[PDB]
Amino acid sequence: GIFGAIAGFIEGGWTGMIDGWYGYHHENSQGSGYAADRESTQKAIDGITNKVNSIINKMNTQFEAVDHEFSNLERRIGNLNKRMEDGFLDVWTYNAELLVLLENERTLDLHDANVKNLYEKVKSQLRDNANDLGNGCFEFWHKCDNECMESVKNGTYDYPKYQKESKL
Amino acid sequence: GIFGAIAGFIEGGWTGMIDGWYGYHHENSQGSGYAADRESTQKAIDGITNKVNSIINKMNTQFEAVDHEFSNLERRIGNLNKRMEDGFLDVWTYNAELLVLLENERTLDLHDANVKNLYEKVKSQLRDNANDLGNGCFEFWHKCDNECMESVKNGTYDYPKYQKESKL
Amino acid sequence: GIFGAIAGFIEGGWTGMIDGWYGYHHENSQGSGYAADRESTQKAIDGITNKVNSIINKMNTQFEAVDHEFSNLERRIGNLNKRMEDGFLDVWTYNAELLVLLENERTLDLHDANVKNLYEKVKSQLRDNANDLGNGCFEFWHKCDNECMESVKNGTYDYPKYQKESKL
Amino acid sequence: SDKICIGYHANNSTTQVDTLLEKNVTVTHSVELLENQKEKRFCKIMNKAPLDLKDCTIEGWILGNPKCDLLLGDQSWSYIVERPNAQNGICYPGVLNELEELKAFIGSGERVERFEMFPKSTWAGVDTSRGVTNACPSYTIDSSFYRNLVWIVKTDSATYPVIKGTYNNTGTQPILYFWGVHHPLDTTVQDNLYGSGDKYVRMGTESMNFAKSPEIAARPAVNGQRSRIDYYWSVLRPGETLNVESNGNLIAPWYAYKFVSTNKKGAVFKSDLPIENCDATCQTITGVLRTNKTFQNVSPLWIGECPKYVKSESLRLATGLRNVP
Amino acid sequence: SDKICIGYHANNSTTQVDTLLEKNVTVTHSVELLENQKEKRFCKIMNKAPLDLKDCTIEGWILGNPKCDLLLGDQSWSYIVERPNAQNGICYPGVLNELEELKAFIGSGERVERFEMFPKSTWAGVDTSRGVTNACPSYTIDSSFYRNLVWIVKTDSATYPVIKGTYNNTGTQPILYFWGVHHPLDTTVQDNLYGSGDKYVRMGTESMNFAKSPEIAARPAVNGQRSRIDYYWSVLRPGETLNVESNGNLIAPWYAYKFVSTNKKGAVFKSDLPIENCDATCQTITGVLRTNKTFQNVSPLWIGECPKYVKSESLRLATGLRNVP
Amino acid sequence: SDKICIGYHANNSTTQVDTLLEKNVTVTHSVELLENQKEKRFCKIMNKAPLDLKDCTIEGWILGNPKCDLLLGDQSWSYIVERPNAQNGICYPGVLNELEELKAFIGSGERVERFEMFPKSTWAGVDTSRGVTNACPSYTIDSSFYRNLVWIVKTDSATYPVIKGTYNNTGTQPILYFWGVHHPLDTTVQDNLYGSGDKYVRMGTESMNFAKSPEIAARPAVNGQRSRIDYYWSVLRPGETLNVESNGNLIAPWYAYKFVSTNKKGAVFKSDLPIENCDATCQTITGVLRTNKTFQNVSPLWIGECPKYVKSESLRLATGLRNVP
């Protein structure tokens, strides 16, 4: 998907994660479940919202056709008016249609990037204390209780504290 | 090149790889050569094709200038017509020229991203059983026959099976 | 910031680095400082300069309104002229305003990518001979003199040469 | 073994968008920017109702065709609705000069007050009481004439003398008014109605002058008539005066309209849609749009504040991610 | 050591593209979207040939200038080509009224059938057999006249009486027709040709009326003549009738054209390019384009299905990747 | 422990930009593309000064209103400035035909040479030395007339005979010239000035004809006058000749202008701004722009080389990166 994560070396999304756009699935002895990363979710919501509103705002003018009549001795100005009106119509149709195609492409890339960046921040904490697996999951070489999980998510993991158990 | 691969920590392309846009060069005791990754190549072809066709499709209208004459008492409407025609001509010229500059930039990024994502898929399978080298190549710390090579390419490698020899 | 580096797993920029846009802070026994990577800086300058000049060049035409008068029997062509002029004005205002928003977004991504790619080039050389830390810094597990620093920056590091001080 | 994964939201959405690289991508959230729904009626705008011309065209209404009496008098409107099959316009054959500019002038207005500009007593020594024709019936009388004009003929026992009228616009509003010049089919009819001699119609203002003479000829019959009238209109600005002078062939102004030009864009909609008692902020030729959206594909013709018109079927912007459940 | 590497294609391409960040980037594959080549000729379109007016202007053709006889009769055309130095137009000096609208009307057509609208016998008690002039030679006679008009003069021994003609358009096609009013240089010529008295030309339809009188004056000589003719044109719609009435100065309609308006776009090209026997789908004023491309920088004026016109020199889109061999 | 870090530039910039995703992003470097500053004055362009009409309108200047004598003669200009409350235009009431096309024609010029086209001696057997009126004072005399026209009347002791004038344009420059037709308030004034009989004004060129007769009527008083003049203008092309012919009611051309058309764009600015002694390359209706920028929000009306007009307040493009110090 450009950053390579969404559909994906992370093949498939999670219907079970309902509280945000990106985040984490964990499983340990104390149970399993989904939790959204709220900081990167909200930041993306603000970004996309701002995008939508900027497009709306910048497309907030209208060309206005008129329905003036023209006699049979005004074929040239009548046709000039027709060509001008269809002129602006075709310009605005193109601008709207293309903008949507382009922004849609980029909006999917942005989501892809955000997933990828989560993945990389976790990878950087865990090192060899977990095995990658290359599908977005990390099998720990040690035992990771719930505040060990919460530790990974909040960006405070303490590699050394489990470095020993992981070697063995 | 934005994702950093094309020209490049992967300095240089391969004239020897003729069957696709991205892929693999292998060398082992049983020989050497180039093979394209078909799935990412095709997916990119479909993407780029669709982009090209969408641009063509959305540019599939024409503003039409007209041959009409104006008398010496119609300088104002004659000039209005001239300014209108040149008006749309300049709008469409700008749209076409800029779209091409912008899409060309993004198309080169896309290719860069796809190469990068191949690289990262291979890296994730091989681990410390091959030495990176940081130029797109992986020197195996064990011996990799042709179906071991096929294995890497089709996304089925078996890390543990060679963890052995990679030891020394 | 999309590539995730600028503001940032690299939270914060360097007022101390005055000679370019991207680069390195080193500290060792022989001293410390900030040094721009000149190749990636210059390449980005050229890219951005070319972008700016291409926009300027492609916007180098004008629609020209006219001060002609219309009698009280020319309400229809007078209004046609008014709508046409305002028509192009609204088209060019949209094109300029949106192009700026879109390019600004992309220009920031470009800078973000270039920082990220510097980070990844370094990471790929150093491996386990340094500890990441995940904030753009690498603590060496060995002793890195000035020629060793220069070595990292110019892309010639020699992992094996220090592989085994890094052991311990 | 303990595990932590990175991933992304999926849901039950089947809604799709297109991108440059790919068509029909199902996404988790999206927003449609285009309106394609309308109420097929006409409503009030800025709380003013539209004017329904019913079975009259603009020409019939404004000249006072006798079959258009239900429109007679003062009117206020937010826009005008003219029905495509309207039958009552110009009944006595001829051309309304600068017709398209007249239509455009009236469409830029919001109110008219009808008033008597030249009472029949203005014109001395002529007959102001026939001037009635079968080309131009009422619903109740088979032979009549426009309610805003007077077809003057000579009295039976005298010549048609020079006649004169004057009207000083002392108000603050411009006055829209009408006149005509009768062009008989032959010399016999010219002589019956106006007597012999070179006839003229002259009209004048501080800023306009008009002069015309009859052009006698037998033209193809229309509503029974081989004669014609040339109809005319003008606008008497505040502080201006109009002098009328004729010795024959004058279709004289009688009633005219104090005219108030509107504050914004006016419209004349040619449509069969019904008018109802409803308010609106956006009224197109083919219906009302009640929408917050930024685009619409309903119609390029409207008044009020409408979304921009485009030819698209849909303009759906992705907000969420590719849906991979 | 056994080795696997990831990489990308390169090839022998030297073709370059530009991007916002960088000019002259060599890429492995690309597609040019703009056409800049044209065959400098005129070809058939929808396999119907263009009409070549050769040494005639539109005026000369349609009025029937005697030197334009090779065009005389029915014509069918995909477009019209008028040569910039064409010498045969209006031979007897004067103005063709509403000329630009005439040119626009004709350019919206595809066929004319020429036919006799008023035979010379229509006009009783006048001479229809002189009306010939040295301003307007044929290739075979020095003194002639337009083939679609009749210059009527009085007989030697009588007054010019009132003359009348009528034509009922019973067909399904509109009729394009012409007339004139002669304006002599002085009273002597007026009296020689039409006799004394106030002269008039009146023409009438259910929807148009025309009235004019001679305007006598000596103007600068053009093709030997200090007199003038005012030429006119109109369109008699299906189901309409035309009445003509004059007692002098009438250049009468004689032949006219049943006119078929295209439901395509029509064109009149002013150009010196040659017409050849070739087919085309896209014909510009400066030549044919044979192309599947979506843009072109050849000309904004065309008929058929052409690419969009832009001022660019090249619009090359990258499809492949940066070429680094 | 030894350390190497990757990082990026920051600085003291507080300058912000907007992006699609985020407003008010402070960046290290940026460039503003839009100009919003103007010198509120008029300057020379291509080192030619503008023509200041001061207390005259275009009409007063070009017809020669006696109160516009400070403009009289040759003029060269880069553009024209007409002041909104200019008081001296048409002094003797009436309409200048095709006024808007006249204004456009003049705006497309850069120079005029005034010259005597028909000396008063052209017109035999008439009085060329009254033709003076209180509607049209000089600064010096209460009763005068346009300096480029001659109001001809009959001599006291004779009828107004046919008069004739001719002018052959043997130069390389087109000539802009004026005439009129007097329309008296009544038959008494017609007879006093021109005597009895059907009067006419005829003008003719190889390519234009004009014919008009007086239209007598009493119109509302303007500058004391219930009579009118219809004023006209035309352009005598190089190699063309003009014949004038009248037996009454002619306001004759006297002085005219050799006219040189610019092959730039010309302009007529309606403004109260002062003209000063300065050069400029870009002059808008509301002031001069001194700028290398590519956009501006000052005015859509200009001459010279100006940036593209847009409605934006600012168009700031990021060049550097997000500033995080």
Ligand SMILES: *C1O[C@H](CO)[C@@H](O)[C@H](O)[C@H]1NC(C)=O
């Ligand atoms: C690219 O630059 C070359 C010179 O290096 C120039 O001749 C050529 O015209 C340029 N290409 C395009 C597509 O403009």
Ligand SMILES: *[C@@H]1O[C@H](CO)[C@@H](O)[C@H](O)[C@H]1NC(C)=O
């Ligand atoms: C889809 O999901 C929503 C909640 O997210 C639920 O309310 C709705 O019923 C679902 N649709 C179907 C068809 O089950």
Ligand SMILES: *[C@@H]1O[C@H](CO)[C@@H](O)[C@H](O)[C@H]1NC(C)=O
């Ligand atoms: C480039 O390559 C193709 C096939 O790979 C070859 O046929 C073609 O001739 C080559 N072009 C040149 C200029 O050699």
Ligand SMILES: *[C@@H]1O[C@H](CO)[C@@H](O)[C@H](O)[C@H]1NC(C)=O
């Ligand atoms: C023209 O012809 C048709 C039938 O041939 C007839 O109905 C119509 O009355 C005619 N009109 C005139 C004016 O002769």
Ligand SMILES: *[C@@H]1O[C@H](CO)[C@@H](O)[C@H](O)[C@H]1NC(C)=O
């Ligand atoms: C900011 O630094 C610049 C040099 O880049 C210096 O010239 C300027 O005076 C400084 N301004 C402020 C407000 O610190």
Ligand SMILES: *[C@@H]1O[C@H](CO)[C@@H](O)[C@H](O)[C@H]1NC(C)=O
């Ligand atoms: C105008 O002048 C030229 C000579 O300069 C002459 O040949 C031509 O006959 C003149 N035109 C008229 C109408 O006399």
Ligand SMILES: *[C@@H]1O[C@H](CO)[C@@H](O)[C@H](O)[C@H]1NC(C)=O
């Ligand atoms: C119209 O009336 C006003 C005010 O009563 C007056 O000053 C003006 O002279 C009048 N004009 C005419 C022509 O009667």
Ligand SMILES: *[C@H]1O[C@H](CO)[C@@H](O)[C@H](O)[C@H]1NC(C)=O
């Ligand atoms: C996408 O394709 C579907 C069929 O899968 C088609 O019916 C639909 O109209 C398309 N949607 C859009 C938004 O173009």
Ligand SMILES: *[C@H]1O[C@H](CO)[C@@H](O)[C@H](O)[C@H]1NC(C)=O
């Ligand atoms: C950004 O917001 C600031 C408030 O800090 C405001 O003054 C300004 O309108 C915005 N910037 C621009 C360039 O408009």
